[PDB]
Design an enzyme around this catalytic site. Structure first.
Site, PDB file in Angstrom:
ATOM      1  N   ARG A 147       0.798  -1.215   0.000  1.00  0.00           N
ATOM      2  CA  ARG A 147       0.000   0.000   0.000  1.00  0.00           C
ATOM      3  C   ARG A 147       0.831   1.264   0.000  1.00  0.00           C
ATOM      4  O   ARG A 147       0.319   2.311  -0.392  1.00  0.00           O
ATOM      5  CB  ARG A 147      -0.939   0.049   1.210  1.00  0.00           C
ATOM      6  CG  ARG A 147      -2.042  -0.980   1.204  1.00  0.00           C
ATOM      7  CD  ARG A 147      -2.948  -0.777   2.395  1.00  0.00           C
ATOM      8  NE  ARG A 147      -3.882  -1.880   2.557  1.00  0.00           N
ATOM      9  CZ  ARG A 147      -5.052  -1.943   1.936  1.00  0.00           C
ATOM     10  NH1 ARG A 147      -5.418  -0.969   1.120  1.00  0.00           N
ATOM     11  NH2 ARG A 147      -5.857  -2.975   2.131  1.00  0.00           N
TER      12      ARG A 147
ATOM     13  N   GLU B 179      -5.874  -9.087   7.306  1.00  0.00           N
ATOM     14  CA  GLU B 179      -6.703  -8.779   6.153  1.00  0.00           C
ATOM     15  C   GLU B 179      -7.374  -7.417   6.348  1.00  0.00           C
ATOM     16  O   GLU B 179      -8.593  -7.279   6.372  1.00  0.00           O
ATOM     17  CB  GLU B 179      -7.736  -9.886   5.921  1.00  0.00           C
ATOM     18  CG  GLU B 179      -8.461  -9.831   4.588  1.00  0.00           C
ATOM     19  CD  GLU B 179      -7.678 -10.455   3.464  1.00  0.00           C
ATOM     20  OE1 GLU B 179      -6.846 -11.338   3.741  1.00  0.00           O
ATOM     21  OE2 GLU B 179      -7.905 -10.074   2.302  1.00  0.00           O
ATOM     22  N   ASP B 180      -6.524  -6.426   6.581  1.00  0.00           N
ATOM     23  CA  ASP B 180      -6.873  -5.009   6.540  1.00  0.00           C
ATOM     24  C   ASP B 180      -7.799  -4.569   7.676  1.00  0.00           C
ATOM     25  O   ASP B 180      -8.129  -3.385   7.766  1.00  0.00           O
ATOM     26  CB  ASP B 180      -7.490  -4.652   5.184  1.00  0.00           C
ATOM     27  CG  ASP B 180      -7.498  -3.172   4.914  1.00  0.00           C
ATOM     28  OD1 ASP B 180      -6.427  -2.616   4.612  1.00  0.00           O
ATOM     29  OD2 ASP B 180      -8.581  -2.567   4.989  1.00  0.00           O
ATOM     30  N   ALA B 181      -8.210  -5.471   8.562  1.00  0.00           N
ATOM     31  CA  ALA B 181      -9.038  -5.085   9.693  1.00  0.00           C
ATOM     32  C   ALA B 181      -8.179  -4.450  10.781  1.00  0.00           C
ATOM     33  O   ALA B 181      -7.032  -4.070  10.556  1.00  0.00           O
ATOM     34  CB  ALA B 181      -9.804  -6.285  10.234  1.00  0.00           C
TER      35      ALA B 181
END
Ligand SMILES: [Zn+2]
Lengths: 530, 207, 147, 48, 245, 41, 147, 49, 45, 82, 240
Positions: free
Chosen positions: C12, G133-135
């Site tokens: 990212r 996972e982006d949490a």
RNA sequence: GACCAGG
DNA sequence: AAGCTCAAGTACTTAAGCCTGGTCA
DNA sequence: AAGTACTTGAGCTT
């Protein structure tokens, strides 16, 4: 809000940022029965475009796997018992009375189990009732050199269920075949593979709770020696642009400025010559980028490989790639938007900040600064262009597969495979006899080529195939006899698959399969005795 | 300059090769002919001097099935109406079952309908020159094709409980069909050599 | 107060966020409001170095690190951990959007299929690709059941 | 379709790779039939 | 250069020249030049959702009482007899000489008798000033003075021929270079002007109906007549604005 | 003493049917010229 | 607007002069004999909402684009006069506070009247195991003390 | 992939970064921080003079 | 079809023999015989 | 059509990925409808895990008819399949 | 050899009469056109088409095409070569003198001749152009366009090793159906290798072997739809 | 049902 | 004459899923 | 916009 496990995620293709999933509930019993049996999550372990596994453990679990399998980790009694138990979690899953452990790898003067010993301990405590031990040798993801010149980790090698040498990574257990989880799915059957994936999951979770892992700032910075190396490399790359451009148009480096500018003006009114120019320019720039990345990023950066918590995540394969740490730490490189490079405005100054007809790489879409140190405005605009191009392409593309999956089901609607083993259309016509000889539908035909794998252990596979019940009802001798006759180099003998369908005659295989087993027996006779 | 004399040399290696491939038999040297071999075979004052003697025949190794084949070339461009039908009674006294023709160019359509109607139980077949002068069946993108006896066709129709309208087809404008001497109704047995798993044998028909 | 995930920063390129963490832990300590306009801090001296000088003044580590003991085991984390002071502008998607359940409810005037709602307890759509999914799974009974 | 709910979805590593979480609202609201036999009468009794 | 131009007008070409002219009150309209393979150029304009297509030499002679030599020396004033332009202008000049007329009066009457039907102008007042009206209303509005319209149109035709002459690049109108912003209030003013033009034309049609019936009340000096007429027609335009918003 | 390939031929006959019928103007039976017909969308 | 270099005073230009004027973007980038204009401060290049994202020049432009488009939907204070607003759906964030990291233009435009979110001690760490996972996670005590 | 591109003659006119994700991506370009919109015209006869 | 009509004739604009060839084509197609359908054209008068 | 005799059966003796599914399903439904449990239960409640407990012992009714694409069928008991 | 390889390359490639010609001035009055041509040395540099070839083919076909297109402009204005002198020796010019009635409007002559130049080709196999040489010690020639017929005649290369970008319609027309079958299998595998995604040839082979079920080849649009036995699908799909 | 939004 | 393949030219349907909001006559 | 197959008229040959 519902809850699922990480593993299935890569199948459903969600980021769990706040996207939502339909939950259904089949009412009747026929429906839920066929669903529970045919479509139980673990029974969809091989995505059917190819054979490779689509499930797997992911980011935290994989880099903490590289931190647990590593030989530098030692656990005492307390932590080992606790961790093994957290990995198993028997009662809720069930199936077992009392857990069995291994002896400590090193014993005196203090009893310290090692990590690979714990991965072996798990592999043991999920051993089926009576199945002979696993054995496997296969290459790992993290190349050995990061550990040491001529280090031995490299490739995971574990016979009889014990991780003798080789750390686990993405490839060992994840979206890569011929590793741990895939061979466990083969040998021990899928309903065990799922429990194994879950067990490794909870295991690395409990470990993370014990130990912790963070992506901290000093991981990014270059050491002073490294950063001045890079600054010298760019001081040498002060000019590459002018040289490459004047070379492509053909004039010397000391050329007259006026003739240089006039040539350049002749260059980008036409457009094909621009494709040539940009080919040459991007060539020289990709050369420069290769050079400075190659000197800096593996050796320059502050922390070494293991103690670095970002190079860990990158080279282990959890998230990202080598290009990501390249951009973060050394330079960004050329920004190629819709192919070639930056678009020129009418007057030929790629940006109003740069003088007309610029030849320095600075205006060719090449940017020197690195994300950690902070990018300049001029270069920032180009980066914005390229990033935004990415978005407007990925958005407007997802409508291109917007007519093909209403094309390839009008004409591949039924295409079922009848019991004559001859795939027909539903109307009744023949399309493929034996499905291109099929070896299966690809979702299981993968391990055929792994002819070493079976001969390696061979004691668990025979029990899996259940020879005592299969050899009874099916014919063996006749088709195996005719296989040689079909392998006769002269013709007038069909491929054995046409003569004797592969359903009942336990003698038919395609040509290349038998050629493979024969030339393997003769090519690699080391495992087979004599 | 004088390359046209190679065009018809390369017209026996597309014809004497087009034999078996049907089940017949031909001398194993008329296939390995060197270039000047033919010029030694067919001689004249020239140095152009190739025509007027390019015609042969062959007898089947099937030894039955009524009957044999006879190859004859009408080299003259625009064969027309006076070189298609006159070369039929010569087939009739020879008792030859099916024969060939080549032409460059353009067998006239007026001399394209009236011909196949008189052939009846015989059939002229089929080609023209300058299009099929390099053997097609010789390449990596084409399998070996084989016909089937009525017994051999019955084999398929039984082991699959099929109807001859359920098996895949081949159109007759196809070079391999016109090459094999196929008629509309017989099943050819093709050898898919796809290196995925061995090579299997599929079948097709024509209509 | 809020644990972010490390595996989310590569792939990212939001290294700016790590810089923001430094800046926040610097600002909160002394009582400053760290100026973070774009393009101020050039390559000669990094912004990281300036904020780090600030931090080591305050007392904490210079790369931003900090030693943290875990909670459930009590022993320290072998490697230090990163702690910053970020600004978490909460978003707006919580409960209205999220959950709709349809056990039994209103139907369509024409074909007696459940209506297209979430205001009329409308049902969720299942087909035209969901059909391909099952009919690949080979679940004709599931297809005939749901559809 | 009936009997089919929907939600935004968070992750959990603790359950299984088989199992899926179900919030209480979906449990209490998603219904399905169960025939009643001799040996699970006890369970349906408790249920009602 | 956009492909639709030619295949719309098959004798036509992608080479075209567009200009968005705007009166002092911001009531703009666009009139474009479409060039055709033969050498003539048609002077596109658009009126009441209706396309319109007139040849440039026509409108150019209609504008000023001119000598054709002034036309040429305005087009290709240069480097006397540069082959490309001095031939293309010859071809255009002969092509317009084909079926046109000579004087400003004759051309204006040609155009007026042509357009009278669609133009909502007074059915009676004139036909010559109808020609001086069409050149006031549609051809080039931002220019007030006729002679200046003439000079600018000469500039335009020279630039267009240069564009075919390959000496001028293809402008890329989809860039912030040649782009501008329409504010809110300007659109508001233009829509108000349009609703007012409609209101006037509507009460005009209403009085025409009163004259059409037979002659129910006919005294165009009496005020009571007009208060009746205003009573009949819808006299609200504000609600049109509010619906718009 | 339906199935797929049936339709492949039964559509070929339809196309040949049109190709034959619409080409003719005068009656092959009657030798007359029956009047032509014009339609609208 | 820009600053003119041969004089020392303001000058404004439109979308023709850009393509033909050598507009230097840094006071130190100025090369004589060519550069006719100097930018005030390249901050003046971006937009309003994009400007107030600290260290906006360290991020991969897709991420600055996401944070821009998604800051326009914060559950923040839509103003201060809410007793007299009959709008349909309004969102108010009970306890918002000023960012500890803020580009000075964030004070000049006077956002401080209108805060958007809070300031959280975010420890970058993969410890809970849930936050992949982006949490992320949320410290329960802070969640009940009024986050 | 046309005019939805951020082609550079906008530097300081209309923002390069901020433009939404999704379908309208690249179309609506929010004006730069300082780019005004000059709306009050002026007198320019002295210019021909 | 109206185009194919012959109003005064009330037969086909095509020759009746050709439409009956067309009729035999379908008659033999009904039982599924493909080459047998192309055979029937083997007549010249 | 035909009903293929036991002497000549072409079909594959393997209890497929599908016949297992449907057999166990319809059997579980049967046993859900107050059917004869042909095997001593273990106290198990679910009307389907009883079906698996039965199929593990190969004491199930419900022969399955495999339709060849011709139109004939072969009728296989579940004990007979592999 | 390499020299003969480049010779065949310049051979099978088509020259367009524009690529040889310089500026084309047309003196007027009568009617007169002059075409410049470069020296024979550079002429054989790019080429190896001979002067007499220029003479003959240029004269004849250039004449015909110029005639046709000037008739085109004449017929559009409605809405011949009496004297011809080529550089019969030096090959550096080509003049043509034509007479036309005075009533005919002026003609855009230089553009007409520039088009006619591009509108005439000397040695062009119908449907081929642009032959190129690219780097494996198995040297091969890239050719833009397709003519299997043209490559049959050429014996400077093997008639066997002819790799093709799909054109499977063409090769099916003259090489079989299994030809096109393996063609599209190779094609789709090649498309899906360029990205490191794996598509095992069982699926691609089934897709192919069905796509050519008829024995020809059917596209995945209205063509293939109209053939199924399901009157519900065809009615569901595109034009109900 | 149509136009702006949004994941 | 007129038969009959040849040419541009005239009509003519598709463009991923979902899901959620809002305003509207 | 892309592109498809569809249909009609004008020029050449028996
Ligand atoms: Zn009649």
């Amino acid at each position: 809000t519902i809850r699922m496990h990480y593993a299935n995620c890569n199948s459903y293709n969600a980021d769990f940022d706040g996207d939502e999933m339909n939950m259904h509930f089949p009412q009747s019993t026929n429906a839920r029965s066929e669903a529970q049996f045919i479509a139980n999550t673990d029974s969809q372990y091989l995505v059917p475009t190819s054979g490779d596994p689509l499930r797997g453990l992911i980011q935290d679990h994989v880099v903490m796997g590289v931190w647990l399998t590593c030989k530098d980790t030692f656990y005492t009694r307390d932590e080992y018992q606790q961790l093994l138990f957290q990995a198993l979690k028997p009662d809720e899953t069930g199936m077992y009375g009392r857990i069995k452990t291994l002896p400590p790898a090193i014993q005196r003067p203090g009893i310290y189990w090692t990590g690979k010993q714990i991965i072996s301990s798990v592999l043991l405590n999920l051993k089926p009732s009576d199945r002979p031990g696993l054995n496997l040798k296969s290459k790992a993801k993290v190349p050995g050199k990061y550990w040491s010149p001529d280090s031995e980790e490299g490739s995971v090698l574990f016979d009889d269920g014990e991780l003798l040498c080789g750390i686990l990574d993405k490839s060992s257990f994840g979206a890569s075949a011929f590793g741990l989880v895939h061979s466990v799915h083969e040998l021990y059957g899928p309903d065990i593979a799922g429990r194994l994936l879950s067990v490794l999951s909870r295991l690395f979770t409990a470990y993370a709770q014990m130990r912790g892992f963070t992506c901290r700032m000093d991981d990014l910075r270059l050491d002073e020696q490294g950063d001045n190396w890079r600054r010298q490399l760019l001081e040498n790359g002060k000019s590459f642009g002018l040289e490459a451009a004047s070379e492509y148009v053909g004039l010397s480096t000391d050329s007259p400025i006026a003739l240089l500018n006039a040539n350049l003006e002749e260059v980008y009114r036409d457009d094909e010559k621009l494709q040539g120019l940009d080919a040459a320019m991007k060539g020289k720039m990709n050369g420069l980028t290769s050079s400075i990345i190659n000197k800096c990023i593996p050796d320059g950066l502050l922390t070494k490989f293991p103690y670095n918590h970002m190079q860990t995540m990158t080279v282990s394969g959890a998230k990202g790639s080598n290009v990501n740490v390249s951009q973060i730490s050394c330079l960004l490189g050329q920004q190629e938007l819709e192919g070639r490079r930056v678009p020129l405005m009418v007057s030929g100054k790629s940006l109003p900040s740069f003088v007309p007809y610029e030849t320095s790489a600075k205006s060719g879409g090449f940017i020197a600064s690195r994300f950690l140190t902070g990018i300049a405005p001029q270069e920032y605009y180009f980066h914005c262009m390229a990033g935004r191009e990415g978005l407007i392409d990925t958005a407007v593309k997802t409508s291109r597969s917007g007519y093909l999956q209403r094309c390839l089901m009008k004409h591949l609607e039924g295409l079922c495979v009848q019991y004559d083993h001859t795939v027909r259309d539903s109307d009744g016509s023949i399309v493929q006899f034996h499905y291109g000889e099929d070896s299966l539908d690809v979702t299981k035909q993968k391990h055929l080529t792994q002819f070493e794998f079976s001969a390696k252990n061979y004691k668990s596979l025979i029990q899996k195939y259940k020879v005592k019940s299969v050899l009874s009802a099916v014919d063996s001798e006749t088709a195996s006899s005719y296989a040689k006759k079909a392998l006769k180099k002269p013709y007038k003998y069909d491929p054995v698959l046409d003569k004797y369908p592969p359903s009942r005659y336990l003698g038919s295989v395609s040509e290349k399969f038998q050629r493979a087993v024969d030339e393997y027996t003769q090519k690699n006779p080391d495992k087979l005795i004599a | 300059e004088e390359k046209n004399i190679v065009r018809v040399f390369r017209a026996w290696k597309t014809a004497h090769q087009l034999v078996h491939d049907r089940g017949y038999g031909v001398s194993q040297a008329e296939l390995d002919l060197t270039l000047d071999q033919f010029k030694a075979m067919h001689c004249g004052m020239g140095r152009n001097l190739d025509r007027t003697t390019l015609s042969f025949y062959a007898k089947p190794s099937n030894d039955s099935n009524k009957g044999t084949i006879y190859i004859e070339f009408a080299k003259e461009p625009s064969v027309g109406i006076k070189e298609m039908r006159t070369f039929v009674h010569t087939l009739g006294d020879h008792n030859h079952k099916t024969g060939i023709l080549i032409y460059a160019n353009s067998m006239t359509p007026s001399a394209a309908k009236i011909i196949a109607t008189v052939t009846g139980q015989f059939t002229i077949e089929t080609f023209q020159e300058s299009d099929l002068i390099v053997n097609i069946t010789h390449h990596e993108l084409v399998p070996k094709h084989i016909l089937l006896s009525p017994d051999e066709k019955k084999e398929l129709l039984d082991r699959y409980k099929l109807r001859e309208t359920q098996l895949p087809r081949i159109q007759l404008a196809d070079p391999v069909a016109r090459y094999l001497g196929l008629k509309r109704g017989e099943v050819v047995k093709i050898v898919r050599r796809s290196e995925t798993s061995g090579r299997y044998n599929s079948y097709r028909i024509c209509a | 107060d809020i644990i972010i995930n490390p595996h989310a920063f590569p792939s990212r390129m939001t290294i700016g966020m790590f810089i923001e963490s430094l800046a926040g832990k610097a600002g909160a300590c002394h009582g400053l409001a760290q100026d973070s306009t774009p393009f101020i801090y050039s390559e000669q001296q990094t912004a990281a170095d300036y904020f780090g000088e600030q931090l080591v003044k305050a007392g904490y580590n210079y790369h931003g690190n900090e030693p943290m003991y875990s909670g459930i085991t009590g022993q320290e984390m072998k490697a230090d951990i990163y702690i910053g002071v970020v600004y978490y502008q909460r978003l707006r998607h919580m409960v209205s959007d999220k959950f709709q359940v349809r056990t039994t409810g209103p139907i369509h005037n024409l074909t007696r299929q459940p209506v297209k709602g979430r205001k009329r307890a409308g049902g969720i759509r299942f087909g035209e690709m969901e059909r391909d999914a099952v009919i690949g799974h080979g679940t004709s009974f599931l297809m005939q059941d749901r559809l | 379709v009936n009997y089919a709910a929907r939600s935004v979805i968070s992750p959990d590593p603790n359950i299984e790779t088989n199992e899926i979480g179900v919030p209480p609202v979906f449990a209490t609201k998603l219904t399905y039939p169960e025939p009643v036999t001799l040996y699970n009468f006890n369970e349906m009794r408790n249920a009602v | 250069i956009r492909p639709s131009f030619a295949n719309r007008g098959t004798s036509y070409s992608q080479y075209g020249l567009s200009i968005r002219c705007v009166r002092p009150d911001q009531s703009s309209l666009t009139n474009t030049l479409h060039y055709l393979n033969n050498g003539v150029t048609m002077f596109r304009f658009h009126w009441r959702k209706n396309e319109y297509l007139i040849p440039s030499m026509m409108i150019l002679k209609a504008l000023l009482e001119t000598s054709d030599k002034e036309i040429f020396e305005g087009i290709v004033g240069k480097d006397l007899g540069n082959t490309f332009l001095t031939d293309r202008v010859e071809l255009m000049l002969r092509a317009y000489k084909s079926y046109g007329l000579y004087s400003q009066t004759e051309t204006l009457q040609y155009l007026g008798s042509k357009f009278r039907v669609v133009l909502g102008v007074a059915e009676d007042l004139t036909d010559v000033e109808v020609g001086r009206f069409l050149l006031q209303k549609v051809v080039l509005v931002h220019l007030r003075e006729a002679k200046d319209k003439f000079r600018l149109l000469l500039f335009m035709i020279r630039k267009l021929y240069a564009l075919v002459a390959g000496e001028c690049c293809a402008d890329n109108p989809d860039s912030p270079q040649h782009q501008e912003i329409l504010l809110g209030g300007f659109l508001y003013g233009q829509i108000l002007k349009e609703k007012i033009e409609d209101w006037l034309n509507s009460i005009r049609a209403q009085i025409n109906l009163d004259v059409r019936r037979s002659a129910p009340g006919v005294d165009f000096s009496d005020r009571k007549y007009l208060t009746r007429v205003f009573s009949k027609i819808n006299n609200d335009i504000g609600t049109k604005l509010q619906y718009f918003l | 003493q339906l199935t797929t390939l049936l339709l492949h031929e039964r559509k070929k006959v339809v196309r040949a049917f049109y190709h034959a019928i619409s080409s003719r103007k005068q009656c092959d039976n009657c030798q007359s010229f029956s009047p032509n017909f014009r339609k609208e969308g | 607007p820009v600053k003119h270099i041969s004089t020392g005073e303001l000058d404004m230009l439109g979308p023709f002069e850009q393509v033909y004027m050598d507009i230097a973007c840094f006071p130190k980038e100025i090369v004589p004999k060519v550069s006719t204009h100097v930018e005030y401060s390249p901050t003046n290049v971006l937009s309003i909402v994009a400007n107030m994202t600290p260290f906006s020049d360290f991020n991969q432009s897709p991420r600055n684009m996401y944070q821009c488009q998604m800051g326009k939907q914060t559950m923040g204070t839509p103003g201060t006069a809410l007793r007299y607003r009959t709008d349909n759906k309004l969102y108010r964030l009970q306890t918002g506070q000023t960012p500890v990291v803020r580009p000075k233009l964030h004070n000049t435009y006077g956002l401080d009247h209108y805060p958007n979110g809070t300031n959280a001690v975010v420890a970058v760490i993969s410890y809970t195991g849930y936050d992949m996972e982006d949490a992320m996670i949320l410290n329960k005590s802070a969640h009940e003390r009024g986050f | 992939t046309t005019v939805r591109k951020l082609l550079p003659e906008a530097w300081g006119f209309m923002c390069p970064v901020h433009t939404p994700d999704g379908s309208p991506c690249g179309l609506l370009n929010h004006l730069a921080r300082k780019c005004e919109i000059v709306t009050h015209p002026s007198d320019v006869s002295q210019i021909p003079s | 079809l109206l185009r194919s009509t012959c109003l005064y004739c009330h037969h086909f604009k095509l020759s009746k023999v050709k439409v009956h060839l067309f009729f035999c084509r379908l008659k033999l197609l009904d039982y599924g015989l493909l080459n047998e359908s192309e055979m029937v054209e083997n007549v010249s008068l | 059509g035909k009903a293929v005799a036991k002497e000549d059966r072409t079909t594959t003796p393997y209890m497929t990925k599908y016949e297992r599914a449907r057999i166990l399903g319809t059997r579980a439904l049967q046993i859900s409808m107050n059917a004869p449990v042909l095997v001593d239960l273990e106290g198990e409640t679910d009307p389907l895990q009883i079906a698996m407990k039965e199929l593990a012992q190969k004491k199930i009714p419900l022969l399955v008819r495999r339709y060849l694409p011709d139109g004939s069928y072969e009728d296989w008991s579940v004990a007979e399949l592999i | 050899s390499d020299k003969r390889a480049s010779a065949f390359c310049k051979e099978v490639n088509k020259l367009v009469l524009s690529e040889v010609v310089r500026q084309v001035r047309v003196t007027e009055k009568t009617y007169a056109i002059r075409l410049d041509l470069y020296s024979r040395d550079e002429y054989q540099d790019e080429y190896g088409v001979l002067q007499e070839e220029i003479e003959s083919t240029f004269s004849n076909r250039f004449l015909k095409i110029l005639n046709r297109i000037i008739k085109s402009y004449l017929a559009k204005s409605k809405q011949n070569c009496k004297h011809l002198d080529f550089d019969y020796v030096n090959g550096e010019w080509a003049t043509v003198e034509l007479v036309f009635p005075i009533n005919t409007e002026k003609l855009l002559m230089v553009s007409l001749v520039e088009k006619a130049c591009s509108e005439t080709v000397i040695h062009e196999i119908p449907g081929i152009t642009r032959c190129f040489s690219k780097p494996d010690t198995v040297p091969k020639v890239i050719t833009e366009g397709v003519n299997l017929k043209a490559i049959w005649e050429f014996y400077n290369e093997i008639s066997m090793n002819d790799i093709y970008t799909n054109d499977i319609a063409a090769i099916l027309r003259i090489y079989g159906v299994e030809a096109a079958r393996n063609a599209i299998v190779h094609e789709v595998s090649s498309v899906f290798g360029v990205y490191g995604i794996a598509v095992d040839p069982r699926h691609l082979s089934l897709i192919a072997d069905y796509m050519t079920f008829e024995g020809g080849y059917k596209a995945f649009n209205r063509m293939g739809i109209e053939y199924n036995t399901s009157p519900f699908a065809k009615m569901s799909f595109e034009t109900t």
